[PDB]
């Protein structure tokens, strides 16, 4: 798929993901949710080749849910991101690699800190205050570099995110049909229904 953004603020992580799905020259859907909840306080957004994205995301989701049940314990965002990275780094030298880029937004309940991890299809992991995949960063990073503070509120993070989406809507040739925004904090995961 196309655009996935992520921003880590004071007490939460915000993920924004495009709604469009295109087959050939036709837009099949304009309400697609490019995300999976891995655990109550960990959310993963994804973008890449058709089909591969969801299979990979659902495969990761199943593994983390299995771990949660076995140990009756939620893995830290760091531990989950490392598991995901290894699966991708394993994949890149396979017969047919999974062509999926991900953002992992999670709230570490132990440390009481939000965490954002950016991982590409090669298995290249980086922890960031804000991140993006594909061409999304080309348009948005200049704004984030300028406006981002680490002590921002969730509301300030959403306003800065709106500005990023507006810039994308102005200068990108592709119509990505807006974004679904989700917030990850101490209380769990919730969707912003008006954006």
């Amino acid at each position: 798929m196309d655009i996935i953004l992520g921003i880590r603020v004071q007490d939460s992580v915000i993920l924004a993901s495009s709604k469009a799905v295109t087959r050939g020259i036709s837009v099949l859907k304009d309400s697609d949710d490019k995300t999976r909840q891995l655990s109550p306080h960990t959310l993963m957004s994804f973008a890449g080749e058709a089909g591969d994205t969801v299979q990979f995301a659902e495969y990761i989701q199943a593994n983390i849910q299995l771990y949660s049940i076995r140990e009756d314990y939620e893995l830290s965002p760091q531990a989950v991101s490392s598991f995901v990275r290894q699966e991708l780094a394993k994949s890149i030298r396979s017969r047919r690699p999974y062509q999926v880029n991900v953002l992992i937004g999670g709230y570490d309940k132990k440390k009481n800190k939000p965490e954002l991890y950016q991982i590409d299809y090669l298995g290249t992991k980086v922890e960031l205050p804000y991140g993006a995949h594909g061409y999304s960063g080309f348009y948005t990073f200049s704004l984030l570099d300028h406006h981002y503070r680490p002590d921002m509120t969730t509301e300030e993070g959403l306003d800065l995110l709106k500005l990023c989406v507006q810039e994308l809507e102005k200068r990108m040739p592709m119509d990505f049909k807006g974004v679904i925004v989700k917030i990850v904090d101490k209380d769990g995961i919730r969707q912003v229904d008006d954006f």
């Binding site: 659902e58 495969y59 199943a62 593994n63 849910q65 299995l66 049940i69 076995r70 009756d72």
Partner: protein, 240 residues
């Protein structure tokens, strides 16, 4: 590979290895399952021959297979871990391929199938384990309680017990459990479960574990003090 047929028929038409696996279950600590009108309770015996135990980290007798289904057992402890692991894997595999969580009946059927497979496969012995599987199907408020055993047969029960002295507690449940009117509340269901274990347990201290499962993935384990209050109230009514 080791292919030796260990589970075989005898002249009288018995598979002794499967029957000896039931003797391992008879040795295991008592486990009991009682379903109320809107809940299921799983009771489990803890033998007090082992003190100086760390109860925080010691493997609990009741295991969550998914957020809405639980599994308790009687028999070999090591064997039970293998069934639980397989069950947990299948639960996630079902969610992944069918997009619905398993029904309690389906999960039971799978675990029972694994047990059966180990009674006619070469080089392996049967599981020395009988299980009680309980929970609520997705978007359903009807309680479910199933039992499995080493042979691989399974069935649904209004109330059931397995393990050592299970003959005694089943005797108790058969005369005390009314089908026309099952334990209407959580309290009544837990009380009847604790009462049934008190026929066999010895001391009502740290020897009784209780786990209540309610609809919509609402599962909680009672603490020592909460159970101790049931133990106190039961005997005070008995002194009459």
């Amino acid at each position: 590979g080791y292919d030796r047929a260990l589970s075989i028929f005898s002249p009288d038409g018995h598979i002794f290895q499967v029957e000896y696996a039931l003797e391992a279950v008879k040795r295991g600590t008592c486990a009991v399952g009682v379903k109320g009108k809107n809940c299921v309770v799983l009771g489990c015996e803890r033998r007090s021959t082992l003190k100086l135990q760390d109860t925080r980290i010691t493997p609990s007798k009741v295991s969550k297979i998914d957020s809405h289904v639980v599994l308790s057992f009687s028999g070999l402890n090591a064997d039970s871990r293998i069934l639980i692991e397989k069950a947990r894997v299948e639960a996630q595999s079902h969610r992944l391929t069918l997009e619905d969580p398993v029904t309690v009946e389906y999960l039971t059927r799978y675990v029972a199938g694994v047990q059966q497979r180990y009674t006619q496969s070469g080089g392996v012995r049967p599981f020395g384990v009988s299980t009680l599987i309980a929970g609520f199907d997705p978007r359903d408020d009807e309680p479910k309680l199933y039992q499995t055993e080493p042979s691989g047969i399974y069935s649904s029960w209004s109330a059931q017990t397995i393990g050592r002295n299970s003959k005694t507690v089943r005797e108790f449940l058969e005369k005390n459990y009314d089908r026309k009117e099952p334990p209407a509340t959580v309290e009544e269901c837990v009380k009847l479960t604790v009462r049934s274990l008190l026929e066999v347990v010895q001391t009502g201290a740290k020897n009784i574990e209780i786990t209540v499962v309610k609809p919509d993935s609402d599962i909680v384990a009672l603490s020592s003090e909460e159970i101790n209050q049931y133990v106190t109230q039961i005997e005070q009514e008995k002194q009459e």
